[PDB]
Write a protein that binds this DNA or RNA. Structure first.
Length: 240
RNA sequence: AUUGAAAGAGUGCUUCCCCAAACCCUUAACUGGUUGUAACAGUU
């Protein structure tokens, strides 16, 4: 039982809801975005099994393999330790995807983003082989973008941390289906990527303010018997 | 390769041009370094 822990000092990401005329984003990267980034890294390493007729089904089978090697659908988690905040960006995005209306149709969409400093990302596996563990360790890097291509990501280091079975407060995401008894945040982040199911995620991140805004930080973590230590502090990852 | 793939709030704009801190305006005036005092006494 090992956990792939990756540190990335990415500046921004954009992952919106079912949104139009504006794209308000999640406070933390969704599991789907992390899985897509890992699939991109795996494809970049070697397309010995990810190369086929179409890119759509190739990405679909890459995500299927990732889910198969992960314990379950809601396995990969993300946890910040720096105060992250949500800001707004107005960019001229094309809206030609609508019914007709030529192809150069573009409007100034308020594509808002989320600024931060540093986050931890944990992947849960099922005792993968040494060759595959090395492949995923070298796939833990090459995360050169998160969410949209307008905001990129940059990993710092990757490691294989052990659960070590110590009781401590947690900071990583966990599904709300089984977490009821545990200052609390909760939304849906589409854990299953859509390539052409119903669950809600929980985040231990509050709102806070400085003058009239909200910069999201973490306070009063709940108690979970599963936690580990890294970089001198203590984090907590839920285990199904 | 990620509710993500494509993605200009962006494209031109003299805060500009005109406009004397400008004009009139004797530190000016009245007023002594002034007054007294042997380089002196004495010397082959």
């Amino acid at each position: 039982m090992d956990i792939l822990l990756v540190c990335l000092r990415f500046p921004f990401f954009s992952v919106a809801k079912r949104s139009y005329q504006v794209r308000t984003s999640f406070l933390l990267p969704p599991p789907s975005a992390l899985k897509g980034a890992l699939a991109k890294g795996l494809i970049l390493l070697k397309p010995e099994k990810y190369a086929s007729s179409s890119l759509d089904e190739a990405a679909l089978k890459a995500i299927k393999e990732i889910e198969s090697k992960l314990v379950d659908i809601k396995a990969v988690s993300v946890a910040p330790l720096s105060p992250l905040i949500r800001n707004a960006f107005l960019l001229k995005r094309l809206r030609n995807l609508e019914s007709g209306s030529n192809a150069e149709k573009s409007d100034a969409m308020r594509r808002e983003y989320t600024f931060t400093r540093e986050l931890l990302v944990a992947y849960i596996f099922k005792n993968l082989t040494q060759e595959e563990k090395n492949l995923y360790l070298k796939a833990a890097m090459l995360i050169d973008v998160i969410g949209d291509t307008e905001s990129l990501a940059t990993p710092v280091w990757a490691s294989f941390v052990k659960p070590e079975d110590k009781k401590a407060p947690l900071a990583f995401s966990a599904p709300y289906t089984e977490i009821y008894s545990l200052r609390m945040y909760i939304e849906k982040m589409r854990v299953s990527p859509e390539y052409s199911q119903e669950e809600i995620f929980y985040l231990p991140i509050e709102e806070r303010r400085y003058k009239r805004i909200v910069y999201y930080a973490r306070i009063y973590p709940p108690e979970v018997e599963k936690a580990l230590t890294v970089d001198g502090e203590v984090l907590g990852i839920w285990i199904p």
